[PDB]
Amino acid sequence: RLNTLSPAEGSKKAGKRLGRGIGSGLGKTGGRGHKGQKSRSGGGVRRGFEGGQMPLYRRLPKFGFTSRKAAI
RNA sequence: GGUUCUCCCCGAAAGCUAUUUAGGUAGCGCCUCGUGAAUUCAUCUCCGGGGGUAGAGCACUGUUUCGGCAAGGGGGUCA
């Protein structure tokens, strides 16, 4: 019977493979569009980057303090 | 610059804001899939609205041509 067990429907998806033909859908850059920083290998912006504008976590003021008694 | 098998369904944008930013990027707008909702939404009819655009006009702010009345101004009679 070892060649009769099957998984539940919807348990597997087979993943996404990029750049494998036209009919496969996401080929020819595999869904990352045309030129640009995001299209490059290893490209992208770090967390909180807004394109040069002051990030939200920098526009706002830090407040409060940590209490050691709260951890005990 | 290149990115390799197939079929089915839906289907954009080239805008705004910010950026040592302008051929990059972030949020929003636009696309897709899922979930939940109210005759929610669109077209038409009727009703209630506020505009100052087209047009027009010259009361006002400016500009413009002609004619009249013409304060006033010059020369001339004077006491």
Swiss-Prot record:
Biased segments, Gly residues type: 20-30
Record-level GO cellular component terms: cytoplasm; cytosolic large ribosomal subunit
UniProt keyword annotation of Magnesium present: no
Region ranges (Disordered): 1-53
GO biological process: one example: cytoplasmic translation
Superkingdom of origin: Bacteria
GO molecular function, one term: structural constituent of ribosome
Alphabetic keyword roster: Ribonucleoprotein, Ribosomal protein, RNA-binding, rRNA-binding
Keyword Calcium: no
Functional summary from the UniProt entry: This protein binds the 5S rRNA. It is required for the late stages of subunit assembly, and is essential for 5S rRNA assembly onto the ribosome.
Family, per entry: Belongs to the universal ribosomal protein uL15 family.
UniProt subunit comment: Part of the 50S ribosomal subunit. Contacts the 5S rRNA.
Name of the protein in question: Large ribosomal subunit protein uL15
Organism the protein comes from: Escherichia coli (strain K12)
Gene from which this protein is expressed: rplO
Full-protein residues shown: 2 to 73 of 144
